[PDB]
Design an enzyme around this catalytic site. Sequence first.
Site, PDB file in Angstrom:
ATOM      1  CG  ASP A   1     -31.645  23.205 -17.260  1.00 60.05           C
ATOM      2  OD1 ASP A   1     -31.810  22.467 -16.251  1.00 60.05           O
ATOM      3  OD2 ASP A   1     -31.401  22.748 -18.397  1.00 60.05           O
TER       4      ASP A   1
ATOM      5  CG  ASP B   1     -40.315  16.529 -16.841  1.00 61.64           C
ATOM      6  OD1 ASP B   1     -41.474  16.045 -16.819  1.00 61.64           O
ATOM      7  OD2 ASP B   1     -39.307  15.898 -16.452  1.00 61.64           O
TER       8      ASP B   1
ATOM      9  CB  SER C   1     -37.988  12.460 -10.463  1.00 64.68           C
ATOM     10  OG  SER C   1     -37.005  11.631 -11.013  1.00 64.68           O
TER      11      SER C   1
ATOM     12  N   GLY D   1     -31.766  19.993  -8.312  1.00 61.35           N
ATOM     13  CA  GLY D   1     -31.246  19.976  -9.679  1.00 61.35           C
ATOM     14  C   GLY D   1     -31.729  18.732 -10.402  1.00 61.35           C
ATOM     15  CB  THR D   2     -31.831  17.795 -14.021  1.00 61.91           C
ATOM     16  OG1 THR D   2     -32.563  16.781 -14.723  1.00 61.91           O
ATOM     17  CG2 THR D   2     -30.408  17.804 -14.508  1.00 61.91           C
ATOM     18  CB  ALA D   3     -29.835  13.559 -12.397  1.00 65.49           C
TER      19      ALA D   3
ATOM     20  CD  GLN E   1     -28.560  21.008 -23.728  1.00 63.86           C
ATOM     21  OE1 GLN E   1     -28.774  19.966 -24.354  1.00 63.86           O
ATOM     22  NE2 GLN E   1     -29.395  21.473 -22.803  1.00 63.86           N
TER      23      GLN E   1
ATOM     24  CE1 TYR F   1     -41.382  19.718 -24.887  1.00 64.52           C
ATOM     25  CE2 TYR F   1     -39.549  18.514 -23.899  1.00 64.52           C
ATOM     26  CZ  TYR F   1     -40.018  19.505 -24.742  1.00 64.52           C
ATOM     27  OH  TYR F   1     -39.135  20.288 -25.441  1.00 64.52           O
TER      28      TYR F   1
ATOM     29  CG  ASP G   1     -27.995   5.816  -0.652  1.00 63.22           C
ATOM     30  OD1 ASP G   1     -28.048   5.346   0.516  1.00 63.22           O
ATOM     31  OD2 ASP G   1     -27.104   5.485  -1.475  1.00 63.22           O
TER      32      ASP G   1
END
Lengths: 212, 212, 212, 212
Positions: free
Chosen positions: B67, B45, B17, B11-13, B163, B95, B192
Site C-alpha cells: 500500500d 494494481d 472497482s 481505499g481497497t474494497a 498485515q 498481476y 449500493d
Amino acid sequence: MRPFLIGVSGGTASGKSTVCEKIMELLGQNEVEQRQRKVVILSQDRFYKVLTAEQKAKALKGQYNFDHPDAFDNDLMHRTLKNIVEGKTVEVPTYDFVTHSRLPETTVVYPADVVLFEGILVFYSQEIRDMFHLRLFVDTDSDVRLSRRVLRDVRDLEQILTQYTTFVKPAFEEFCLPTKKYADVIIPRGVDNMVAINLIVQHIQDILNGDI
Amino acid sequence: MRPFLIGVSGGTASGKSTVCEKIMELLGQNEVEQRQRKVVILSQDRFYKVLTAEQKAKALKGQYNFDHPDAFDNDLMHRTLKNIVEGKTVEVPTYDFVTHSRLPETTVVYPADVVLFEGILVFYSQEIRDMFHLRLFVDTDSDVRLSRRVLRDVRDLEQILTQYTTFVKPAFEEFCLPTKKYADVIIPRGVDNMVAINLIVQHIQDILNGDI
Amino acid sequence: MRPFLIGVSGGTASGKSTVCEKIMELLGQNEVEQRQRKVVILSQDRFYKVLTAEQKAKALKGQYNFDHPDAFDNDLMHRTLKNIVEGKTVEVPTYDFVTHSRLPETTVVYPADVVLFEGILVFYSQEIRDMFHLRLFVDTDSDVRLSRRVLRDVRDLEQILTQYTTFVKPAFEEFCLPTKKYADVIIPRGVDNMVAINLIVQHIQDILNGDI
Amino acid sequence: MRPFLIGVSGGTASGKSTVCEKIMELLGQNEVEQRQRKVVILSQDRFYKVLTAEQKAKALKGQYNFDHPDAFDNDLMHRTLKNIVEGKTVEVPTYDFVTHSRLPETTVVYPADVVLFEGILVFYSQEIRDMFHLRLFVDTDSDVRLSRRVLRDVRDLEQILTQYTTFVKPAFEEFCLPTKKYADVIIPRGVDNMVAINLIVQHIQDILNGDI
C-alpha cells in the site's frame, strides 16, 4: 419525473447555497424574470417559523435555537413542495433574519422543470427526503464554515461566537451531519469545486434538453 | 478532450472497482470484445512491481507493504497513461496476487473515448493527478472495507489481519486518505449508490453521443 | 467517596476490558480470591437480558441487536450499582455468549474500595453515568476493533461480518460513540498504552493507601 | 526521573495552556516567585525564531506560516530542554506576538521537580518527544478552537480568518494533528475538564511528595 427535484444540504456556509447560485448563473437562469424560469432555487430558510413574543425575546438575547428541526415550519415546507411536485404555482414566504419575522409579501414560484432545494435540514425528515430525485451534500469542515459564517454575520462578534458554541455546533452535529448518509453525491468545499458544479449543470441541461 | 480520463480512487474494497464495473455493465460495454470497446477500465494494481527474490520472501512472511506508493511501477503507469491520452494502443501487464509476480502475457488496450482509471493511489502523484478530467473518490468506512477485504481474502485469516494492522491501515491513512482532497466528487458507500453511478453513466453517454 | 467508581467505556474490543484486567494484574488483585479483593471489575455484559424464545431464534439467525441499550437489563444493572455504591454485597449474573442465556449460578461481589465498571454503554444513561467518580473511554479505530473482534469470534466468519455490518456498526455509532463526550480522560489504543494504565494504577493506589 | 517532564500538546486555543495554568494554580505554584518554584510551565512559543527583514514583511501582510515546524528555533528548544533534564538553570526567551520579534530580556528558569512543556508541535520531533515521561494531548474541535482564537486575536478580523484558512488550518492538519498518536492520555475540551486536571494534579503531588 417533472419537476426534477434536487436536494442540496450541508452545514450553514458550506457552499450549499453558493453552489445553487452558481448552477443558476451558468445555466443563464438568473438573467430571467422569476415567472419565465425553468430552473428555480428554493431555500429552507424561507420556512423559518414566525416567533412568538417570547421566543423573539430569547432570540435577541441569543438564546433561541435556529438549527433545531423544530425551528422550521415543516408543515408549510412539506405542502409547498408537495404542490411544486404536483406541477403547481406556489406562494413562498420571505424571512427577515434581523427582525426574526416573516415579511409582508410572498414570492410567487411558477412551475419549473428543475427545482434546487437547499438547506441545513432538507434530508432530516423522510417525507421530504423521499421527494428528491438527486440528493447532494456539500461537505465543508466546520472551522472553514464558521469563518465564512462569522465574516457574513459581522454586517456582534462575541454573541455570534457564543450562539454558535451553545446552539449551532451541537445542533449541526445532532441533526444535520447525520443526514450526510442520505446523500447520493458529496461535493467537497463549495463553489471552488467547478468540476462538480459543471457535472450537475450538464445533468440539468440533459433534463431541459430532453436527453433523458 | 479525447480520451476523457476519469480517475476513481478510494481505499481497497471501497467500491471504487465495483463502481467502474457497474458503469461498464450499464453502458453495455462489458458485452463487447476488448478491441471494440469505447469505454475501458484500467486498474492501478496491474502496475505493481515485479518483486526481487527477497522482497518476495518478505511477502510470503507477510512483511511487504503493498500500500506504499513505492509498491507501484510508477514510471510504467505514467508512460502507459501518457500514451492512452495521446490516443495510442498500449500494452498492459496482468498481476498475479498469489505469486506476487507479473504474468507472461500482456493485455492490449485500444484507443477508448473514455478511460476509467481506478486504484488506491491514482491521485498521489501530481503528474498522474493532473491527467484526469474528472476525479472521483469512493468513500467507505475502514471497518466496512476491512470486512469486504477480509471476506475476499479468505479464498489465512490471522495473517490477513496482522498485515492489515501493520501495513495496510497505516499506509492507507498516510498516502491514500489525504488524496481525498483532490476529488471533484465523493461517492459514498460503493455499488449500493445507484443514483451516483447513473449520474456518471449519463455524463459518459453525453461524451459518447457527442452532447459535449 | 467509598467505593470509588471508575467507568470505562469504548467500543467492543477497544481495550476497555484489557485495560481493566491489566489494572487488576499490576495492582496484584487478580492473585486474590474474590471475597478478599479491594479492587473489583464489573462488566456490563453480565447484564444482558435473558432472551425470549423468539428473540433467541432471531439470535441464531444473526438478526438480534446486542449493541442496542434495550439489549441490557438496565434496571438490574442500576440497582446492582446502587447497592455497590451503598457499600453492600451484591449478586451478579454470568452470561453465556453461545447459548445467549444467563447461567444457573451468580457471582458474589463483596464491598470494594474501587470498582472498575466497563462496557459499551456504561455512559448512555444519566442515572448510571452520574455515579462515576472517574469516566474513561478507550478510543480505538473501528477497523482495529473489528480485527480483534473477528479474531476473538472465530473460536462463522461470514455471519460475524454480516452481523457487524447490519447491527454492531450502526448501534456503536448511534449509541456508544456519542457517549465519548462524557469521558474525563480518553485512553487511545488499549493495553498497549502502559503509561495510561500506570497513571490510573497510581491514582487507585493513592485511594487504597488513603493519600486522598 | 528528576525533573519529570510532562508534554502537553493540542491545537492553538485547545486548552493546552489553560490546563497547565490551572495545574499551577491548584498546586499553589503560581503564588510563588519564579526562583522558588518546584513546578514550571514552558511554552513552545517562547522558541519562535527571530524573523529576517523579509519574513517580517511577509508577516505584516499575513503571508508567514507560524504553524510550520520550521517556524520554531528547534535547536535552541532542544538544548534548553536537554539542560532542564540535566537539572540545570536555563535562560529562556520571551516572544512579542505583535512585533514578531524576541524581547531584550530573557527569563531565568531554575531547576524544577516537574516541567509542563506545552505547545502545538512538542511531539513533532522524536528527539524532544522521547524526553517526556508523560505525554498529554488536549483534543478540542477546530471550530471551537477557532472561536477562542478569533476572540483572543481581536485585541483585524478578516486577516485573522484569511491567515487561519491559508496557513493555520493546513499546518495544524499536516503537522500537529498527526502527533496525537503519541499522546498517552487525551484530554477533551480543555480547562472545563476539572476531573482530568485533578488527576494530573494528584499525579504531580505524588511526585513532589515522593510517593513514587
